[PDB]
Design a protein around this ligand. Structure first.
Ligand SMILES: *[C@@H]1O[C@H](CO)[C@@H](O[C@@H]2O[C@H](CO)[C@@H](O[C@@H]3O[C@H](CO)[C@@H](O)[C@H](O)[C@@H]3O)[C@H](O)[C@H]2NC(C)=O)[C@H](O)[C@H]1NC(C)=O
Ligand SMILES: *[C@@H]1O[C@H](CO)[C@@H](O[C@@H]2O[C@H](CO)[C@@H](O[C@@H]3O[C@H](CO)[C@@H](O)[C@H](O)[C@@H]3O)[C@H](O)[C@H]2NC(C)=O)[C@H](O)[C@H]1NC(C)=O
Ligand SMILES: [Cu+2]
Ligand SMILES: [Cu+2]
Ligand SMILES: [Cu+2]
Ligand code: NA
Length: 499
């Protein structure tokens, strides 16, 4: 069952074996992935997170981010450790109490401390629309139509070298899949459909790193939502989905009753499908209970290309129709060397006092804020442009901005900008060498918003900066509850930190 919008959520350690190999994990709600948190657009969510963690090998502190929700007026509830809060300590709990005005779509939640979400703390978060403009395009939209894609590691995250190219041991679809080495015929996930019905499949990348080539043998997929943003219908036969992105697509159960492979090929780790790796099963009601015999094509004739996507609403693009045509035009220097990433010459290392608390304590400008050189101020009520030129090792890097979505003015692998009708989203591949992926948004949400690569290993190695949006209005805009003001004293006391 789905939980929320008002719910407790316990964070525990347990052994799991999603690919047949047993390892300890960090779990929300006792499962991998965690339970779906759900509500309707505009609802008040109050998720009281109980930190019950005791295994130090995966960290006993935690903090949870609600990925893609803007948190307007509730920056304190956003979750990134040392940006908007100190972590929750073990044996304590914290109510993330926020509202979701003006958003409806497919999201997710995950740990936002260190690389802890890799160890298991990841699940879906869906905000339904009772008046959804796409409602007439399908029959079924519920917990059975969510499809998660996850990387899974046999080595615990805190034992992964920083700045290394770390590789997974299994792809998991809806929590199940097979190991790339020492493969055993462990259970595969089954997605069940009824011949003739149309399904809103909500495809969620909960990846810590790889991108997936996602397809379903015999079927095509009609995209109607991108990272929470309704799209015009776009029919494709393959979706390359980068870490943390989401799509809704219509699946028409219009093929002969039978079994069909669902495929998710990562860019690293095991290649192909031998032994049923990288696979799940689409089963029609009435089909025999047996594995599919279907084949992938050698090439996919209608792959998703990001420039083909357009918003359903007339969203346009803020600013002027040329490079630098914004109130605050930025170009970030994104680099990697010797195990560490940097942005504008500075590698991100989390500060001792969270950025929001520094601002609430009176810090007057981005040069007063720590980490030095890791915080850029943005002016209020202004069009921001951010060019993100690729090249840094370990690509393609999916960049994500907290507190906002954005127009994708220029996409990967295509030098032509679009100032008319590009898709809006919240996580974007910046492409390959020589690309100049560029985003735009307007600043109507005061607070410190993290901008970072969403390959979690890269974030840990410093590939991040903080946009301190409208510093002057941050305190008046984001009143903080006593439970939030209690978090840093408790955390620093527990860890013997002075501040
Ligand atoms: C990606 O697009 C951005 C614009 O969105 C490009 O930024 C432009 O970069 C050039 C140099 O690469 C800048 O010109 C330089 O300015 C300094 C003075 O600040 C001057 O000393 C240099 O001789 C040169 O004029 C320009 O300001 C900046 N912005 C623009 C044109 O709007 C960026 O180059 C693009 N990157 C790639 C890889 O395509
Ligand atoms: C590379 O990216 C550019 C920019 O996003 C893409 O260019 C855009 O291509 C579309 C589709 O062909 C053009 O729209 C077309 O315009 C006319 C109406 O004016 C209409 O009759 C067509 O059916 C469609 O609407 C669009 O104008 C164009 N925009 C720009 C700024 O050039 C391009 O397709 C991408 N390259 C690849 C290989 O996908
Ligand atoms: Cu995220
Ligand atoms: Cu986020
Ligand atoms: Cu990266
Ligand atoms: Na415009």
């Amino acid at each position: 069952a789905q939980i929320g919008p008002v719910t407790d959520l316990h964070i525990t350690n347990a052994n799991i074996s999603p690919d047949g190999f047993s390892r300890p994990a960090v779990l929300a709600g006792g499962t991998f992935p965690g339970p779906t948190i759900a509500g309707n657009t505009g609802d008040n969510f109050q998720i009281t997170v109980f930190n019950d963690l005791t295994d130090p090998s995966m960290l006993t502190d935690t903090s949870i981010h609600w990925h893609g929700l803007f948190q307007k007026g509730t920056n304190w509830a956003d979750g990134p450790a040392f940006v908007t809060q100190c972590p929750i300590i073990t044996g304590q709990s914290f109510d993330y109490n926020f509202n979701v005005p003006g958003q409806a779509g497919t999201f997710w939640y995950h740990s936002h401390l260190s690389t802890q979400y890799c160890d298991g703390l990841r699940g879906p978060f869906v905000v339904y629309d009772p008046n959804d403009p796409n409602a007439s395009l399908y029959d079924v939209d519920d917990d059975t139509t969510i499809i998660t894609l996850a990387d899974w590691y046999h080595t615990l995250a805190q034992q992964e070298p920083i700045g290394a190219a770390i590789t997974a041991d299994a792809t998991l679809i809806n929590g199940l899949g097979r190991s790339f080495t020492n493969t055993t015929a462990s259970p595969l996930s089954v997605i069940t459909v009824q011949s003739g019905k149309r399904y809103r499949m909500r495809l969620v990348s909960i990846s810590c790193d790889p991108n997936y080539l996602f397809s379903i043998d015999g079927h095509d997929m009609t995209i109607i939502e991108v990272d929470g943003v309704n799209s015009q219908q776009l029919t494709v036969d393959q979706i390359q989905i980068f870490a943390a992105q989401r799509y809704s697509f219509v699946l028409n159960a219009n093929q002969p009753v039978g079994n069909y492979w669902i495929r998710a090929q990562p860019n690293s780790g095991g290649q192909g499908f031998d032994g049923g790796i990288n696979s799940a099963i689409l089963r029609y009601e009435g089909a025999t209970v047996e594995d599919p015999t279907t084949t992938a094509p050698t090439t996919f004739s209608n792959p998703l290309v990001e420039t083909d996507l357009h918003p359903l609403a007339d969203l346009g693009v803020p600013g002027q129709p040329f490079r630098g045509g914004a109130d605050d035009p930025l170009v970030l220097n994104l680099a990697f060397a010797n195990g560490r990433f940097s942005i504008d010459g500075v590698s991100f290392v989390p500060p001792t006092v969270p950025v929001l608390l520094q601002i609430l304590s009176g810090a007057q400008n981005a040069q007063d804020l720590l980490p030095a050189g890791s915080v850029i101020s943005l002016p209020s009520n202004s069009v921001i442009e951010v060019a993100l030129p690729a090249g840094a090792a370990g690509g393609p890097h999916p960049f994500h901005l907290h507190g906002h979505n954005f127009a994708v003015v220029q996409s990967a692998n295509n030098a032509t900008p679009n100032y008319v009708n590009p898709i809006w989203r919240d996580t974007v591949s910046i492409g390959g060498t020589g690309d100049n992926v560029t985003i735009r948004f307007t600043t109507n949400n005061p607070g410190p918003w993290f901008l970072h690569c969403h390959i979690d290993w890269h974030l840990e190695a410093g590939f991040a900066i903080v946009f301190a949006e409208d510093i002057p209005d941050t305190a008046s805009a984001n009143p903080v509850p006593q439970a939030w003001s209690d978090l840093c004293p408790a955390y620093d006391q527990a860890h013997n930190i002075s501040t």
